Design a binder for this molecule. Sequence first.
Ligand SMILES: OC[C@@H]1[C@@H](O)[C@@H](O)CN1Cc1csc2c(O)ncnc12
Ligand SMILES: OC[C@@H]1[C@@H](O)[C@@H](O)CN1Cc1csc2c(O)ncnc12
Ligand SMILES: [Ca+2]
Ligand SMILES: [Ca+2]
Ligand code: NI
Ligand code: NI
Ligand code: NI
Ligand code: NI
Ligand code: NI
Ligand code: NI
Ligand code: NI
Ligand code: NI
Ligand code: NI
Ligand code: NI
Ligand code: NI
Lengths: 318, 327
Amino acid sequence: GSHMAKTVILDHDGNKDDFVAMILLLSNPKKVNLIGCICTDADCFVENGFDVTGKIMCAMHRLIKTPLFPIGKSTATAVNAFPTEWRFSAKNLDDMPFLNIVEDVALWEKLKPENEAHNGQQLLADLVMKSKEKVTVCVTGPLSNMAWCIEKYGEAFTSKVEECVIMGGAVDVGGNVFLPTTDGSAEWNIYWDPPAAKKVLCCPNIRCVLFSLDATNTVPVRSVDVKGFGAQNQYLLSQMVGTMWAMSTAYYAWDALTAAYILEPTIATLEPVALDVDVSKGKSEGRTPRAGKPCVHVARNPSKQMFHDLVFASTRVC
Amino acid sequence: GSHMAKTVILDHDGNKDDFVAMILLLSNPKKVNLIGCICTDADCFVENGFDVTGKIMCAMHRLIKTPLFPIGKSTATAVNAFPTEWRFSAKNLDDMPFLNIVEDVALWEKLKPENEAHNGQQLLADLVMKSKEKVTVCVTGPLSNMAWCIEKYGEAFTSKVEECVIMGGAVDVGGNVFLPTTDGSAEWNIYWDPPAAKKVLCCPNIRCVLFSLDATNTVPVRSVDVKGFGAQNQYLLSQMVGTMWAMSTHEEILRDGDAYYAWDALTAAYILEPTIATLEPVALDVDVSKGKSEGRTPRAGKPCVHVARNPSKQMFHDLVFASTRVC
Ligand SMILES: OC[C@@H]1[C@@H](O)[C@@H](O)CN1Cc1csc2c(O)ncnc12
Ligand SMILES: OC[C@@H]1[C@@H](O)[C@@H](O)CN1Cc1csc2c(O)ncnc12
Ligand SMILES: [Ca+2]
Ligand SMILES: [Ca+2]
Ligand code: NI
Ligand code: NI
Ligand code: NI
Ligand code: NI
Ligand code: NI
Ligand code: NI
Ligand code: NI
Ligand code: NI
Ligand code: NI
Ligand code: NI
Ligand code: NI
């Protein structure tokens, strides 16, 4: 009732917050058994996302003996691509000193070829279907990999999912996709691939917990807080997350909060809502307005203090 | 004949490379006695640049007992302001973990108020004029502070300057100021204040060594190199420079060959190793017009500056990595 770690897969798109989320999960083996990561060419260049995912894995394995796990690059392609400016952040992280410690680089170069052979969508399907226990899939990128799995395998996949904890959408607040051709109502992870979002969010065979902008707007990354990691600079994870956050000091802790829920389910209350995902090519493309028969459990009023305490504790692990 | 240290002041504008330059100088006390820093509100927000300068000073002082020194915010104002996107980098650095170690933050808070009372221009004039030995001023921001000192004090100031080693200009290559109102021939530190550059660069009373884009184009900040700092991650100065560089390695790809270069770091490296580049005497005709060529430093004649040529990539590399193993 404690002593059994949730079995988890992180399905992410390699920006700074995706990696803070990965650190939260992987640094808490008591609560989380991370059996796999998928990386999608969305808010990153996938090769950089792949390398950074690899090196973080290796670093934690060295320091706290968390298991190694398979990592796969998804071949999903954008309906609507992220701005290039944003996508470079995983390149920067790849070059960071904390991600080039010689032992980690040596292990990753050894492990990289086997992982290079994986297809990400197929890996997500295989990890979930072979798992002994039901799996919690943490989706911090677009929903394309989940959608592919559901379409290809149906019940054989969805029956093995405990729940899907998703960062995406904006229900009662504005979105964050501000383009000449959009109205500002949509959120980027949905907008990257709306039909995939529509297939997963309102899939009747799966429990979705949704961290939409409604909740994530509540946890901006701010200097006053980020400065706190200096007191912890001896810990590699504090160097990692302090730097990720300092490069960002808004930028919100979007994906990190989503992973925090898996660690502490009381962090937010949940509201069942039926959503009508806009898959049109109009200016409201990607919107997730209230539709009815509930699609998702929307996170509400996340605890800033609980979040804060969890991030700072986790970054003292090593 | 080789065993002495040069007295140096760093006059900078607080972007990432300005701080690598500062680390190079301050980490080499055998070669350099850093007696002061000036920070200008150019390629940074000055309050951030001030704080980062402070915390780097304190960190070195803790680790290797380099002296503390006065720091002053210049009140110089732009003729042409820097893009805001670029000026945030010192805010990011101010929030980094390697610049919030509790002992360093405590010392800086104690030292800040005395330093806050300085005027940057006046401090530059005072440090140079009181110094026992002639001073090398390393200028890695705009030339506004040097210009002010020359104009206010003349030879009382300039007679005390050993030489002025400057990052700025583009002589035989294109510039880096790309605006709807400019032609691309100008470099940003000149462009920020062209009359100040014209006053200092062709001041007949001072030796200027110029690291213009000609030389700096040769040292782009590249992933394959920056990854090297990981082998040195136990050293705080490797964390610092590795991060500053790793925040910068994407620009070459994003901007189609227009890299983030080690501009100011190479300029400081010259002070540490004068053989890193050869020098060519050139007369320059600084364009102070309001046309699209504003800030250009074309060849004019009676030499203004000694322009750095063909810097040694390997020497630079070896100097950066050794300096970052100091602590
Ligand atoms: O919409 C939030 C999702 C989260 O999964 C983050 O990884 C960023 N991602 C896209 C995104 C929206 S604004 C924004 C930004 O400003 N910079 C980088 N990425 C983003
Ligand atoms: O012209 C080079 C001088 C050097 O002193 C650097 O500090 C940046 N600075 C301005 C500058 C030019 S391009 C560029 C850039 O791309 N990012 C930030 N700063 C700059
Ligand atoms: Ca993401
Ligand atoms: Ca500068
Ligand atoms: Ni138990
Ligand atoms: Ni092992
Ligand atoms: Ni495999
Ligand atoms: Ni459109
Ligand atoms: Ni705290
Ligand atoms: Ni000597
Ligand atoms: Ni002391
Ligand atoms: Ni004073
Ligand atoms: Ni603004
Ligand atoms: Ni190699
Ligand atoms: Ni391009």
